[PDB]
């Protein structure tokens, strides 16, 4: 996951 | 609020 | 947005671009009135960043955009950076936006409003179109  | 003057086309 | 389409210019008039002082777009946001923008807490906005309203094509020099300075950053006190929960920040503008055909506010819901699974909604932005 990654911040968008 | 929430009512654009230029209507979106989807 | 991956596999989206180009918007009609000006048709999402609350959409703003958050740019750093070098002019780099790093996050979106939404105008909720002339003085306040909602964005994500994890965007890490500071008072050196700029809110750009009225933009469509970031490669054009001919658009009547508004570059608005930020007075104060209000990060939600319940934001949890470990889980990215409660991911909301308010930006109070130093200079009010001038509302027009291409710049205006989105509505906020009531706390009790219901948006059912399966409802079709819309998202907008200048994020990557391919990874």
């Amino acid at each position: 996951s990654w911040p968008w | 609020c929430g009512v654009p003057a230029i209507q979106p086309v989807l | 947005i991956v596999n989206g389409e180009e918007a009609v210019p000006g048709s999402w008039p609350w959409q703003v671009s958050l740019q750093d002082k070098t002019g780099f777009h790093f996050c979106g946001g939404s105008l909720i009135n002339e003085n306040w923008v909602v964005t994500a807490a994890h965007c890490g906005v500071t008072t050196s960043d700029v809110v750009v309203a009225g933009e469509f094509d970031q490669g054009s020099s001919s658009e009547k955009i508004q570059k608005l300075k930020i007075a104060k950053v209000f990060k939600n006190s319940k934001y949890n950076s470990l889980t990215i929960n409660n991911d909301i920040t308010l930006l109070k503008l130093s200079t009010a936006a001038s509302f027009s055909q291409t710049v205006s506010a989105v509505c906020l819901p009531s706390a009790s409003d219901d948006f059912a699974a399966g409802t079709t909604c819309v998202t907008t932005g200048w994020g990557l179109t391919r990874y």
């Binding site: 990654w2 968008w4 | - | 596999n3 180009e6 994500a40 998202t123 907008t124 200048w126 990874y131």
Partner: protein, 96 residues
């Protein structure tokens, strides 16, 4: 890197219970999932809107937050759930 021109996509809301099939315990009550429908939000979209029409007006339901590190179009994106946050918005505006 980011597109010059503003993009849009339509996409469905999911329930948190169903979103947990993808993301497990990472999904909290102040999150709402959308997508897994052939589109995805992606890096640089964060902070922007997820809007739904309600009584004829576009209403802010989510704030683009996080999701798949490859912006997979078959995985739901995760958005901050504005109904869970709107009391704080209103309190902050009233006090400042």
């Amino acid at each position: 890197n980011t597109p010059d021109r503003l993009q849009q996509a339509s996409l469905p809301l999911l329930s948190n219970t169903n979103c947990k099939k993808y993301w497990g315990t990472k999904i909290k009550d102040a999150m709402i999932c959308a997508g897994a429908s052939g589109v995805s939000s992606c890096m640089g979209d964060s902070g922007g809107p997820l809007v739904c029409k309600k009584n004829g007006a576009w209403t802010l339901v989510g704030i683009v937050s996080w999701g798949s590190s490859t912006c997979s179009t078959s995985t739901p994106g995760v958005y901050a759930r504005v109904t869970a946050l709107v009391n704080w918005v209103q309190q902050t505006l009233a006090a400042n």
